[PDB]
């Protein structure tokens, strides 16, 4: 899995489109997989918050962070923030200005990476984009 491949143009016109200001704090969901197959889920994750942090310089809420976010809301410690009501709450807790969905679909040999852009403000997807995952 060419995780850099398929991400980093991704981040990259996420980068150039209105309403998305670098420097921001942002909360990364982790790659949702919905293959045929088993993904190595924090892998992709991993690479997506490299790809994030060093491009647009982006402040990304923190692994930690998370965690103990969940637990003050209440939820499940492996909860994943896969429900936008579920990812404000937990975004407003931190100091985060966008959540960030992405989903691997597909073939498990030839996923199609999809992203999409939270304003945690009023819940509007400001920005998606889709590119496959090559070899």
Same mark, same amino acid.
């Given at each position: 899995y060419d995780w850099n491949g398929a991400m980093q143009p991704l #981040? /990259?016109? &996420?980068?150039q489109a209105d309403g998305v200001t670098a420097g921001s704090v942002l909360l990364v969901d982790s790659v949702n997989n919905r293959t045929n197959g088993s993904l190595n889920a924090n892998e992709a994750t991993e690479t997506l918050r490299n790809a994030l942090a060093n +491009? *647009?310089?982006?402040?990304? #809420? %923190?692994?930690?962070?998370? /965690? &103990?976010?969940? !637990?003050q809301l209440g939820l499940s410690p492996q909860d994943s923030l896969g429900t936008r009501s579920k990812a404000i709450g937990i975004a407003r807790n931190v100091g985060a !200005?966008? #959540?960030?969905? %992405? /989903? $691997? %679909? *597909? +073939?498990? +040999?030839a996923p199609a990476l999809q992203m999409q852009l939270m304003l945690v403000q009023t819940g509007e997807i400001?920005? /998606? *984009?889709? *590119? $496959?995952? !090559? !070899?």
């Open positions: #981040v /990259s016109k &996420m980068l +491009n *647009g310089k982006f402040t990304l #809420v %923190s692994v930690q962070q998370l /965690s &103990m976010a969940k !637990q !200005q966008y #959540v960030l969905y %992405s /989903s $691997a %679909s *597909g +073939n498990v +040999n400001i920005w /998606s *984009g889709k *590119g $496959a995952v !090559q !070899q």
